[PDB]
Amino acid sequence: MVKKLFFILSKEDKNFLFFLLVFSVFVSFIETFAISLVMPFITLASDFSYFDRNKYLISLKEYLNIPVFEIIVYFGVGLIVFYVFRALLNAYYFHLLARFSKGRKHAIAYKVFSKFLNINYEKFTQKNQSEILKSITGEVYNLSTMISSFLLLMSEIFVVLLLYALMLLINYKITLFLSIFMVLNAFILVKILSPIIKKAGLRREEAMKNFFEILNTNLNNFKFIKLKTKEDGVLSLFKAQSEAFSKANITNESVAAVPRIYLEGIGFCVLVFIVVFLVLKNESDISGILSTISIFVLALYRLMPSANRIITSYHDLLYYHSSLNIIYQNLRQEEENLGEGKLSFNQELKICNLSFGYEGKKYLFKNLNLNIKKGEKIAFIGESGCGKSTLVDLIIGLLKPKEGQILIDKQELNASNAKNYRQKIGYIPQNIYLFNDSIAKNITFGDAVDEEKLNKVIKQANLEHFIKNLPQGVQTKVGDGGSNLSGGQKQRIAIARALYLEPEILVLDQATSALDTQSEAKIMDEIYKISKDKTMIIIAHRLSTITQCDKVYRLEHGKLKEEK
Amino acid sequence: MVKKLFFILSKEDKNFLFFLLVFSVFVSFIETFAISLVMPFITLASDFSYFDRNKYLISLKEYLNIPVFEIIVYFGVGLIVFYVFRALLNAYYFHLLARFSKGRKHAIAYKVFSKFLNINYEKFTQKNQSEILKSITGEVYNLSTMISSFLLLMSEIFVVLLLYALMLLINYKITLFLSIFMVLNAFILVKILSPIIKKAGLRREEAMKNFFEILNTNLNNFKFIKLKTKEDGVLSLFKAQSEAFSKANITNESVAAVPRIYLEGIGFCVLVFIVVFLVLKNESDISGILSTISIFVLALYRLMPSANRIITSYHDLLYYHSSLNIIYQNLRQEEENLGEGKLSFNQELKICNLSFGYEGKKYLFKNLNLNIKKGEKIAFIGESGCGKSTLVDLIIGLLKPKEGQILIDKQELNASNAKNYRQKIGYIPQNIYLFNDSIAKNITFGDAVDEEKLNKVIKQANLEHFIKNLPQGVQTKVGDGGSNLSGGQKQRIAIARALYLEPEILVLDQATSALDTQSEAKIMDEIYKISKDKTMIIIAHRLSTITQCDKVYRLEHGKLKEEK
């Protein structure tokens, strides 16, 4: 299952993964030596009580220079450089963890967004956007923190090992009683409480669902609630379900606190018991072993979050991990459209027996036929969600037809020339969603700039009377989609964005549904003038907004009728 | 600002608040007693001779005890009994806190949800659902978890008060050094790291929105992305924004880890200092003062989460707190409709010059005239945004008009009888939002059971041939909005739900939009036959569905023309 990991990471990503793995081991050796460095220093300081017992001062300090109180201070500041050094080195390690995790958050997510951009429009249509968005930004945060949790896990299990080795290097019955008492505490909390952690933890997820769902549902029938006027039948189901949500939630916040509270009374008991074994058993080394009792203290102080993070990354390697890496390939190994070829449009746009519906949806057409000569300016009158936008999705390069040909100058519209065919069409989606940046980038759609191609477009899209009064001019921040741009201002910008492509076919797609009565016809004429040199397809949800359209195709229940 | 508190909470919520706050003070004495029980037990475990000296430990030595080693062991189990008692004690305290917080998460949200359910229909229309939803379950969530933080804060500052006082009794120079060293580390970290925590932490909130908005904008323009074909212009604005979001996130999760990593070096250095400083000073009682080292160890080990929970509750008392309490006097003290009277309907529903607009908008009508006789079966033909549902919501008891009479048998529809007139109308929404419960509860609208009238409702809503194939039948948990229920069967419940009200006027409101003509025509024919004994206002969105409609009022752009 590990083979799916190396498939995503590259040389700037893989080499960084190894650096953290070695540093995870080295940071462990740094912590151990930082602990072990207390033992000599505090042996010599505690050796002052027993005067002289071993060659540790009067019989050891006389090997370099200086007196006793000077070598105990120098050893003291020697302890505090190593600890400030560690405090910086351990901080740098926890910085490389974030630099690698959040750097892969970008390096990985940069490609999945391209994958869902290259799939056919039908494959982007079958899955909703509230799912693809999570497929290109939700999975990456989980994988990044999972690899970081994996590297931090290696650092920790290493810290635990060699620090336990340092404890075993000191005492026998204690480190034995300590290891036994530690693994006894690793139990119960992981086998009797950890099940109840989710036994009352997923019942809280059950209760939160049972509360949010009936709360959102209750707000929708507010009209029907005002008609009923009696809210008793609704609040008698709300108070009992909220009270069902209440205790199902308090049992989660109770069993999530028992482990640490019990671990505190334990930690106290395993602490004072590290003492009751030293004074009773006659290893009474006022400095030899009283130094080591401080080593057990510091070791435990470095060991409590040491054991906590292991279970944290363990749950992170089960909650995440195997459920994230598999979907990754499948979503990024996904297939994308491949076609090379050109096509020319000078005569008419034959359709030739389309017959189409979505993947698992019924056929909203069946033997749908029409043709569009250059410059007809046709329309598509329909009943909303019946098959207008579906048919126009078929006319354009999107949606490969079932039994259709869609001829262009007696030449079929297929994947070879659909790439070049998609270039000469704008969209202008009336309720156009802009991104918070300059309107110039919103017209160019980010594809750099061309200035000599923007002023003419703005002048044609009747935005010239709009750029003058803006504070930053063409550089003013558009503010999300609209906000700073009202509906028809977004229309003019959408028209400008389409005109910037220098197209030959323009499609409206309900371009009159998000405006007032006065703002529609002016924009429609402002489009009719700049479409005199072009063609046009209109998906009007109403009649008389097309009038100047020489063709009016009304799609009913599968068949295409013609009006004006 | 504290006066806003007692207005919401009652007497029980005050007896329980004192229950928690006195416990908050007492749990500090239990911890200190659990720590202060160590120094005697350890000063007697080491120096056995204390059990035949001092006016405190002499006679108990020869009261059933016999030797000295037997009583010190007894003292040990007495401590672990106290520590298991203390662990159970703290588990009960942290059990009442979560019971009070998640208890007020229900008690408050129940009142706020009841308040938003009884306001006028116009006040509920102006604000979106996610705002109200978070106003009745997100705001309650923050205030609930805030009160517990204040209690825990006072409990916490208390345990720091008497644990620091217990340390002062033990030592003079050591506690003084620790306090100076603490308030030196309480400084620097709160004024040098804390700025960069938010200087790179609220920059994260900045970069996250600036990274999501340009990503979520591209998904809505995926159609135009396929047309442009070139993604380099989209990815040159994505890679440059992501390489900025990358570093903007690595520095946040780094500076949020600088404290505790520097804190480790602090904890290490303040430990070996204590024992070295206490081993250089010649108070070496072998046990008298070297046991006090263990009290300092247990005191600090109890003071690390002690310092963490104080700032956690202080952040909870600033991040939330003042932003929640004020917005409840402005959410709970909300005003609601009045009136107490009855109304009768038997002749005509004269509208007579409606003219209506919302709070601060324009008027969609300006003189709108019609009249509805009992049993006229009228319809409203308009556009997708003209005001088709507005006029009908004006005819019925909803929507207090600006200049409209809404006469009912030459009697005015006002607040005294709007309740009674709302009682005699049923909505039957086509895209009905069902709740995951038995279909009987769905039809009753939660108003308990009623097999008498309710059994007749199923026979009227022609669900009987669908209840038969249903596994649980009338008690079938419908399965959220629409599990195995097709669109037509959802409509049958929509009719059944309003039929249980025993109404007099039936609304439809776009009862044709998302179902094939057949699966709806069978429902539309069912409607016209069961509407003979009542009146009905249809807000049809498409034509040919109002064949047998005797009246068809078409509202254009302010005036009302009549069709069939």
Epitope: P471, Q472, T476, G479, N484, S486, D516, S519, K522, I523 | -
Partner: nanobody, 123 residues
């Protein structure tokens, strides 16, 4: 539920100072750029000034150029506008509006409104 209420412009003789304060509610005040407009007696509408989200880029019109200085206070959620000298047109009641109201179509939008302060400063 966007509801704005500006109230700080009374009749004071020309050649002096008059700062109007527009209060806003119902939206993130900082993310939205703001503007000003006015409706003349008998005439349709007429634009005044504009400003960005950060308040670091200003805009005015030729009939009021070099006369006003616009400031944004993102603390009290208020949009100020200093005024000096009044013409038989600087009267049309300055409302507030939300985003960029400046073209001849996005003016027919009730993005704010709210009473208003009449400032008919004649000779």
């Amino acid at each position: 539920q966007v509801q704005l209420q500006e109230s700080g412009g009374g009749l004071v003789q020309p050649g002096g100072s008059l700062r109007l304060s527009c209060a806003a509610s119902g939206f993130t005040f900082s993310s939205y750029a703001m503007s000003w407009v006015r409706q003349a007696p008998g005439k349709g509408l007429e634009w005044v000034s504009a400003i960005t989200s950060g308040g670091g880029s200003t805009s005015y019109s030729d009939a009021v150029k070099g006369r006003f200085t616009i400031s944004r206070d993102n603390a009290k959620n208020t949009l100020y506008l200093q005024m000096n000298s009044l013409k038989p047109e600087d009267t049309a009641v300055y409302y507030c509006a939300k985003g960029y109201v400046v073209d001849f179509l996005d003016l027919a939008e009730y993005d704010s409104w709210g009473q208003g302060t009449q400032v008919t400063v004649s000779s």
